[PDB]
Structure formats: C-alpha cells, structure tokens
Design a protein around this ligand. Sequence first.
Ligand SMILES: [Zn+2]
Ligand SMILES: [Zn+2]
Lengths: 50, 66, 149, 258, 115
Amino acid sequence: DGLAGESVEFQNLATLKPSNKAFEKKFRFDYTNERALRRTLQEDLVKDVL
Amino acid sequence: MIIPVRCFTCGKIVGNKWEAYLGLLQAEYTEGDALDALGLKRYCCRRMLLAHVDLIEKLLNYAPLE
Amino acid sequence: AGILFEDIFDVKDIDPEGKKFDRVSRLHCESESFKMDLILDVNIQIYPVDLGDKFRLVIASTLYEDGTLDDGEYNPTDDRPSRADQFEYVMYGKVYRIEGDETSTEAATRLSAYVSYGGLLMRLQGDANNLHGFEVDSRVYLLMKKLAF
Amino acid sequence: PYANQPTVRITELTDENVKFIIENTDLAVANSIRRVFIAEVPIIAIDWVQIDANSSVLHDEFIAHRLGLIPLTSDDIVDKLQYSRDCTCEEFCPECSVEFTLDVRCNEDQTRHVTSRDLISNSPRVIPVTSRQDDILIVKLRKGQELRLRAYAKKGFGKEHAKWNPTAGVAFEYDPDNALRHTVYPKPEEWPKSEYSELDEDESQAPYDPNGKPERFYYNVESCGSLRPETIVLSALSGLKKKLSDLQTQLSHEIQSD
Amino acid sequence: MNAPPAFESFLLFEGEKKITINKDTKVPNACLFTINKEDHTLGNIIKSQLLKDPQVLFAGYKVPHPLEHKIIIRVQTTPDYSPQEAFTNAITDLISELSLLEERFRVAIKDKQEG
Ligand SMILES: [Zn+2]
Ligand SMILES: [Zn+2]
C-alpha cells in the first residue's frame, strides 16, 4: 500500500457481512418517504431531492 | 560485632544496656521479661538485644601481645 | 428562570443489584405528577436517604434567580443570591446523551436524559414534553431538598 | 481571616518523656511541630574526632562513629554556643565548641570496658549521660592495646545528621476513634482500641462526622537523655518561630526591593 | 563519591535568594512564591493558614524534586487583596499563634511541677 506502520489503526467494515435485506435499508437512502426526509433533511432540501 | 549506641529505627540509646541485659538474663530473668524490665516498650528497639551478635569476643581472642 | 425541570419524587428502592461502592448507591425513585423514572446517585455518606422519603428535585441551568448563565468555575466569594440557599444537596454535571423512542416518521413520545455529575449518573426517563430544556453538551444542576412531610 | 487559640494540657510529666495534648489547632501545624521535634532541634554532639593512637581491633573510623552517637546534656549550653559554621575565629574555640579527651590503655590482665565515663570534658555541664544505669560502652580493650584521642563537640540539628536527634520516638496521634474516616477499616471489629480512645468496648468505632475538623492531637515526646522533653518542645517552638520571622523579614525585603 | 553534604539542605549558597516572587500571567492576582533550602515544614503550615483566610481563592505548594531543596507556593486571592499581604498576614498571625502556644505550654509545665 505504501503507508507507514505507525499511523494505522484497527477499524471495521460496515458494509462487510450484512444481510441482503439490512444492507438495502442502511445504504440506499430511500427518496420516496417524504416524512423521513423532513425528519432528517430540512424543508428546502426535501423538495429538491424529490 | 559490638552493641550499637542507638536503635536504628527509633534512636533510643541501647548501647548502655547490653551488659545489664546479660546480667538480668544471668540472674533468673528471661528475655521476655528482661526487655521490659530494662525499659524497652517499642518492639523496634527490642531487636538490638535479641538480634545482636557479640563477635567482639572472638576478635579479642586474637590478642596482639601477651 | 432557567428551571429545566421541577417535580416531587419519592424513593422506592435502593441498590437493587446490591450496593457496589461504599459512598454511592442507586436511587430508583418515581415521580408523583409527571410519572417519570429516576436513577439518581447521591452520596449516601454525607447525605443519607432512606426509603419512602420525598424530595423536591429541580434541574436548573443556573443557580441565580435572574439567570445570568455563569461561565462555570468555583468562586466562593460571591454575595449574589443563589437558589442553593433552600436546598440541602446540590450537584453540578453535564448531560451527555438524550435517548428517546424516536422512529423514522413520527417524533418521539418518551425521552431519557443521561447526565453525569463528574461520575454520579442519573437517568430522568419519561415523556418527551417536559424534557424540552435538555440538550446534549450542556451544564445543569440538581437542587434537591428532602421533604419533612 | 486569622488563626486560632490552641490549648495545652500535660497528662504525664516525668524526666524521661512528656505526654501533652494540643487542642484547637490545624493538622498541618501539629505535623510540622512533630517534624521540628525530630529534625530541627539544636543540641550538642561530637562532630570532630582527632585520633592519635588506636590499637583496638575495630576500624579507625568505628571509634569516631560510636563517639558521634553518644548523647551530651545541653540543658543550658546549647542556647549559649553558636554554630561552628558562623563562628568568627579559627580552631574550635570553647565559646563555640566543647573539648573532649579519652586516654585509656588496658594494663591489667582483665579486659577493659571503655565507656562514655572515660570522656573527660573540659566543661563541667557538658558531660555524657552519667550524672544520675550503666554507661554507653564505646569499645573493649585487651592487655596490650590502647585508645588515645581528643574530640570537639558542636551544635547541630537532626536535619544535618542523626547524631543531633534528641527525641527517641514521637508518638503522634489524633482522633483515636475513627470519626473523620481518614482511615477505612475493612473489619473494624478486628482492630484493638487506641490508648486514648474514649469509646466503650461495645461499639468498634465512632459514627461518621461530616462537619468535623481534626483536633486534640496527642504527643509522647521521649527524650534520649540529652535534652529534657519540655525543653525539647520549647526549643523546637522557638526555632519554628525564628524560622517564620526570618522568612517574614526576607519576604518584606523582597517586596520593598521590587 | 558524589553524595552531597549535609549543610546544603538548610544553608543558603552565595547568590541564592531565600525567597523570590514571580507573578503569573494566566489569571489575575496570582503569584508563585519560590522558597529555597526548605521542606514541607515551612510550607504546609503556610498553606493551611492561607486556606483559613476566605479571601484567598487558591493556595497550595509542591516540591519540584525531593533531592533538590526548593518549594513553590502558588497563591491567588481576590482582585482587591494582593497575595503579598496575604502571605505577610499568614506568617504574622502564625507567629502569634505559635508564641501563644509556647506561653500556654510553659505555664502548664510550670504549674504541673508541684501543683
Ligand atoms: Zn527500636
Ligand atoms: Zn569560635
């Protein structure tokens, strides 16, 4: 890789070993449920993403 | 080799008590009563009369002259 | 004002998984009007408490009546009025987690304020209506007084 | 914003030790007074030995070591003499030192016991502890050996060396009943009761006391024989007062200089 | 071979000051008093006496290194009360208390003998 061994730390891969169903409901960003978008994004973004 | 002058831990003078300790052990008294008959209450000063070895006698056996 | 919360509680159980430490214990208290849980940890040594006792807990953001939002530091030499004059047990901490029963569509109905007073924890679990004054990373007080009744 | 009015009460006054109690004072003052009792107490002791002929079996330095630990009574001499370092002359002047001499040679057949009694001092009041009980044995000589020397004594304090440590052991103790919880006993029933404990034999320790300060500090200053115990206490307090005064003077000079 | 002597614990060296005042820059009205050739005997009593004074916001000493003979005392008082006068008052009244303790102990001793 070309990296020094000092600045490396243990981590985890979220997208490694999900289930097919859970992987779809965690990394897809459903753009149909406008209520969730209003809860998460602001009003001036839900209309833009829809 | 010789009795110290003072107890290492406390500092009470114990040098002037070896001969008296020997005499009290000599007459009839035993150690457990001799130590408090001499006036040693703390246990730190009691090792000076119990743990001490009297090696000066062997050294004096090698008289230089006569 | 700065009164983030005010309600009467009463103690019903003390260290129910067994007392771990020697100066702190769990106080699984309950409310009387708002019907909310309480897991306060008081210093049982200096401020003993027994079961059945009632106290007036008031989470306040500041100790001053006028609410000047003190910076936060020990300044004993202060002649200004302090709300702690009518309380037998005052503490100072910083809420760090506000958990609730949120979902993806409809807002939460019950929150849970987790505040740590430098080591002594408390969970003020209950409805999501009276906990509007709690925000993560904010200093708060305790201001309890045992009721003689 | 001021200090307190401590009280004193002596419980046992003897010629070997004193047991007094100090009430209404801070712990720091008590501990400092103890450490001054042990370290910073002026007292005369042997610190310069000139050995001319030592035919004994022990080392040449052993004689000086033992002579350094022999106590010397300084009831009214330590306050008069001045530290040899601050002297304004040459050689150990009698105004700032005390001379000693020892000349013993075993001539008869039996072995000699060179004790502190052989230390012939020039001054009458500066003598080893033999006035009013046997004497500190220095060394043992046999027929044919000898020990001639002369030493001088000076003023010093325990902080410099243990030879100037008048107190044998200070029994400092406060709050006999564990009321302030400064120590937590895992099993209080397994511990014995303090000598000064006022609680009955039923309860193991006194109950907790939130608003309580340490008071009633107990003392058992035990004199080795050189200085009297009450004399030790007075000298230590006077020295602490002098140190405080010198510190105040230095601080005042530093402030005015700025 | 290089063990230090016994007089370097209390005796001042030529050029070395007994006490030095140094104002701190992090907070107002705070000075660090550095004492030379002393130990906990002369710092703990002053620390406690300062603690008694309510106008002293901060008070505490330390030992930078046990082999080295120096103590630093940091004092922080109210802005209307300099720490120099706080230190002076603490020393003065501590001296007064020690003198009174001496006098009481002496009269108690003189009464205890045959009385
Ligand atoms: Zn001992
Ligand atoms: Zn001289």
